[PDB]
């Protein structure tokens, strides 16, 4: 069966940088038959609302246990709203299920870390997709971290591509990886 884990709509500020949550991450992990699609968007808040070309790169790491449950140790962690999306509504169901493991990156396929670096438009509608208003977002899959069994890292990179101060309001980003077996 398919299974979706997500932040819900109207995500909380759930991306920690230096022990303060400052990035509002919409993250949806949807497992269909075999592949998991990561559908994500980000909005910087407070001091991260506008990012400059001098902005240092940073990782937002999600750490998951062997059963596909978010741990409390990553930059995106179990202290914010996170759980299953039921088919038919926009609720976030925190009660774990055995099926949550299916949202995880296949440990044999990703026994060494994998990555996908993609273009990450910022404020794209307002800047009308001006080429120097993109950064990059790299998904890193299963880079080891602590005692996590699975990890997903959103790494934001190459802010020096920006022509000036830009609202840190990312595009909707999509990634794919092979899902774990039950």
């Amino acid at each position: 069966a398919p299974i979706t884990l997500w932040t819900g709509p109207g995500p909380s500020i759930n991306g920690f940088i230096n022990d303060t949550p400052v990035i509002r991450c919409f993250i949806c992990l949807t497992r269909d038959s075999n592949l998991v699609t990561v559908n994500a968007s980000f909005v910087g808040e407070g001091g991260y609302r506008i990012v400059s070309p001098t902005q240092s790169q940073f990782s937002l790491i999600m750490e998951f246990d062997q059963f596909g449950q978010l741990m409390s140790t990553g930059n995106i962690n179990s202290t914010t709203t996170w759980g299953e999306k039921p088919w038919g509504n926009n609720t976030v169901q925190p009660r774990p299920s055995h099926t949550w493991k299916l949202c995880m990156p296949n440990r044999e396929v990703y026994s060494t870390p994998a990555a996908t670096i993609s273009r990450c438009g910022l404020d794209s509608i307002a800047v009308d997709g001006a080429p120097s208003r993109s950064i990059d977002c790299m998904l890193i899959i299963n880079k080891p971290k602590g005692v996590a069994t699975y990890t997903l890292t959103f790494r934001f990179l190459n802010f020096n591509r920006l022509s000036g101060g830009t609202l840190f309001k990312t595009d909707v980003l999509t990634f794919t990886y092979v899902g774990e077996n039950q």
């Binding site: 909380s12 949550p21 202290t79 709203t81 759980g83 609720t91 976030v92 925190p94």
Partner: protein, 123 residues
């Protein structure tokens, strides 16, 4: 209660400049609300085009209150036991720039409720 709810989910409040504004956000949890308590307040100021700007948040049993520079040292959770159902805040030394719509969002998954307060400040 039956679901996660906030008492009086829309209010209109009028204060004088220099006053302290009490913005109530009392909530009731239901038995199914088994996720972490996840509370934030946002401001949509009349001053500017900025909308839904976080001013204070409660997450991981910690308060984070350094997001909105205009409200540095001027916003605080009032309750000594916030997890018990009281997300209300004080906004001290009111300014005319403080005029806007304040929103209290309380989540305890799958519970979600929100409340809007329209704050006016007079000279």
């Amino acid at each position: 209660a039956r679901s996660l709810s906030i008492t009086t989910p829309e209010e209109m409040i009028e204060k004088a400049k220099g006053e302290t504004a009490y913005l109530p956000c009392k909530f009731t949890l239901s038995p199914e609300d088994q996720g972490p308590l996840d509370i934030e307040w946002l401001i949509s100021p009349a001053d500017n085009q900025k909308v839904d700007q976080v001013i204070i948040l409660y997450s991981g049993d910690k308060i984070y209150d350094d997001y909105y520079p205009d409200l540095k040292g001027r916003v605080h959770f009032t309750s000594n036991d916030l997890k018990s159902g009281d997300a209300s805040i004080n906004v001290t030394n009111l300014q005319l720039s403080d005029i806007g719509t304040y929103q209290c969002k309380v989540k305890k998954a799958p519970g979600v409720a929100n409340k809007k307060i329209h704050l006016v400040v007079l000279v």
